[PDB]
Amino acid sequence: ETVINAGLPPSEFWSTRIPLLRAFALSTSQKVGPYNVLSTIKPVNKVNVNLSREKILNIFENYPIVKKAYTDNVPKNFKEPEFWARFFSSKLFRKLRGEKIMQNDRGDVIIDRYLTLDQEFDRKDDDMLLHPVKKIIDLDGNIQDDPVVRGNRPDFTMQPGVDINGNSDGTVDILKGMNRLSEKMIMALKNEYNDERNELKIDDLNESYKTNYAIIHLKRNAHEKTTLKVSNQQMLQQLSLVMDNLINKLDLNQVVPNNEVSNKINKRVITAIKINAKQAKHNLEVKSTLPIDLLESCRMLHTTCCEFLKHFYIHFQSGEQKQASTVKKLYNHLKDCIEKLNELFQDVLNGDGESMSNTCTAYLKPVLNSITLATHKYDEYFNEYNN
């Protein structure tokens, strides 16, 4: 209603709805944090494993080799479902899962071709993580503190396990794999999107934190609301009179009225009750006599009129003279709305024979008064400024 036929600029319409735009943007602009996707993948003859696009995307991000194989093969040789069925059966998934590879069992011929490539990525990733470390936790210097240290070499319990042939059993490789995975996850956090001294100090021994909140003292004084004093002798005499009346006796039966003010009192009380009862008798939208078609049209005209009023006030009270032209354009739009409001009343007057026109005019009286009042203020201020 406000953009297509009314002609309000699209940019202006969004000025008052920034939070709605921002809330919707952040909903689709946020992503979950990194996590070990392959650990959640449990094979669980028939084995049923369930996958989702979110997990598929996570696998690529956490493991570029999978993306390298996926991108160059899915459109070329076979469909994606075969690929993931092929990937899981392969030893690459077992190696990427941090599980020892067994020479007894072989997985996928196609995927295994990338095993050597991974050995190249790991070395490239090792340099991607290698960097100088602070001397505080520099374990390399501890062993290099004495370069000529020569004692008794540690027993086999203090060294990586080996097989009968003397080569590594391979259990150390998975330990590095999990260590590399954790290091990559933390590094991924630190993307594009003096200190030692503080840490070594004992905070508990320092002075306790002291609050620095400000105090306020409020003086109290104000003027009285803006649109014959008895003397002491009179007080004593009047006080004496009441004491004599009270001490002597108290009269209760005299409280009965004269029956002339009671009728006036009853009329006055009922006079207020009728006014309150009239308001109280009509104190989900309320049922309306207007037909549904007419009522919906009135709401559309009310909503659009209010939207124009909202925009007019923001620019009118902006305080910058650069928007004078826009005010004129909005002022012309307001004039058109007034004509449209008048036209609807004329259309309803002839269409409904004044039966619904009176009811329709009341429903739009508050907005009509506001619209004409808004124009009057614009004209009054325009008159003084221009002339």
Binding site: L252, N253, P257, N259, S262
Partner: protein, 445 residues
């Protein structure tokens, strides 16, 4: 039904007698309190103004929400004739009873009261030691006689005559004993307030020729009196009534001055727990009560086995239930007593059971049953056993010459509701003894 019972009695009183009942402000102050809150509001408005107000003005006061109450209030107010409807000049003017209006004004304004509230001698006595014990014992003595438990002193013939003449405590000379009835068990169930009104309400109906108005001037005036105070001496009929009231544990007399009792003030308005008990699946009873009242009432339908200082233990048995049922006690009343006198522990677990029932399936709201369902079913089943054999008294009709006559006579009995059984094939039917004479007369005609 406290006010309803009292209000119902006041309606049957003739309007000519109702006017006399409003002469004493003491009665008016109580009759003013019994009306609904909305009714009291309007009465206080009309009392002090000497004018006539149309009913439409009264309707304006009430909001649309309270329109229904305005119908009950006006109907109840008009029934007692306190509100006099006068129609003139095309308008249904509304006015209050002049005697009721004058009586209320005198009391509220401190005017002459004609000693409706009595006098004071300033001879106060100790109430807790004697008045509480005397009336509690006197009210307990009649209950022990009602319950049937032995007790040396028996109530005076005045109340005893009232009990037998009343539906309460049906008696038979041939049996030579007194037993409680269905309403008698209900009487024992009613709170002390209603428990006192029932006997008094029966007393109002029992009395004949002592004027009807005088009896009400005394009973209502009794509530106005304050316990622990002296009052000089009263109507001639009230003197014998005062002695009569002394038999009900309402007024205490030293032997010139009469002293009301705690029950007198309790008549106007209202005012671990004693009597609470636990029911197990073994039909056992463990009452955390130390009081003859709770013990006496429980023995009606419970076979007591032992007792301690703080609690009483017993076991429900078919014999005890059968004895209670033989007296006319309905199983519904028994369960009501148990449900309304349940221990808090039972209620808490029962609430948990309801919460658990709703927790598993919150769609349905099962009833909150404090005691295990099996007990209710078995008690109801025992009731069914007593109702197994059904027998009627009457006459059997047969040997009908024509089917039309058989259908005519049988149809006639059905119309008057005296037909108990019929068979078209055998052309026979049975009718109740009550309708025998009516059927025979129709047969002749």
């Amino acid at each position: 039904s406290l006010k309803h019972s009292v209000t119902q009695y006041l309606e049957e009183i003739p309007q000519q007698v109702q006017n006399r009942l409003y002469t004493s402000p003491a009665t008016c102050l109580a009759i003013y309190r019994i009306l609904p809150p909305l009714a009291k509001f309007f009465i206080m408005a009309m009392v002090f103004n000497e004018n006539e107000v149309p009913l439409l003005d009264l309707d304006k006061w009430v909001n649309s929400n309270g329109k229904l109450q305005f119908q009950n209030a006006i109907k109840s107010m008009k029934s007692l004739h306190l509100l006099i409807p006068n129609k003139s000049s095309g308008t249904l003017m509304i006015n209050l009873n002049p005697t009721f209006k004058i009586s209320l004004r005198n009391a509220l304004t401190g005017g002459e009261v004609q000693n409706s509230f009595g006098v004071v001698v300033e001879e106060n006595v100790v109430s807790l030691d004697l008045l509480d014990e005397y009336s509690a014992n006197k009210w307990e003595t009649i209950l022990h006689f009602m319950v049937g438990t032995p007790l040396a002193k028996i109530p005076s013939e005045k109340v005893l005559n009232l009990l037998k003449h009343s539906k309460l405590m049906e008696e038979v000379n041939s049996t030579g004993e007194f037993k409680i009835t269905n309403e008698g068990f209900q009487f024992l169930l009613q709170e002390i307030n209603s428990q006192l009104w029932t006997l008094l309400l029966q007393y109002l109906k029992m009395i004949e020729t002592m004027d009807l108005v005088d009896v009400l001037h005394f009973i209502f005036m009794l509530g106005a009196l304050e316990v622990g105070k002296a009052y000089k001496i009263l109507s001639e009929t009230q003197r014998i009534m005062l002695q009569d009231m002394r038999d009900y544990g309402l007024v205490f007399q030293k032997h010139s001055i009469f002293y009301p009792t705690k029950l007198a003030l309790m008549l106007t308005s209202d005012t671990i727990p004693d009597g609470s008990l636990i029911v197990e699946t073994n039909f056992k009873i463990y009452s955390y009560s130390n009081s003859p009242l709770q013990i006496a009432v429980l023995s009606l339908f419970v076979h007591l086995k032992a007792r301690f200082v703080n609690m009483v233990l017993g076991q429900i048995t078919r014999e005890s239930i059968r004895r209670a049922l033989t007296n006319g006690i309905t199983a519904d009343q028994i369960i009501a007593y148990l449900e309304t006198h349940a221990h808090p522990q039972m209620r808490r677990l029962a609430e948990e059971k309801l919460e658990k029932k709703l927790e598993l399936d919150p769609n349905c709201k099962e009833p909150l049953q404090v005691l295990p369902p099996t007990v209710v079913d078995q008690i109801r089943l025992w009731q069914l056993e007593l109702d197994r054999v059904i027998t009627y008294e009457g006459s059997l009709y047969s040997d009908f010459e024509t089917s039309q006559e058989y259908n005519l006579l049988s149809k006639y009995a059905q119309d008057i509701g005296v037909l108990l059984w019929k068979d078209d094939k055998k052309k026979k039917f049975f009718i109740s003894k009550e309708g025998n004479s009516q059927v025979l007369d129709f047969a002749k005609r």
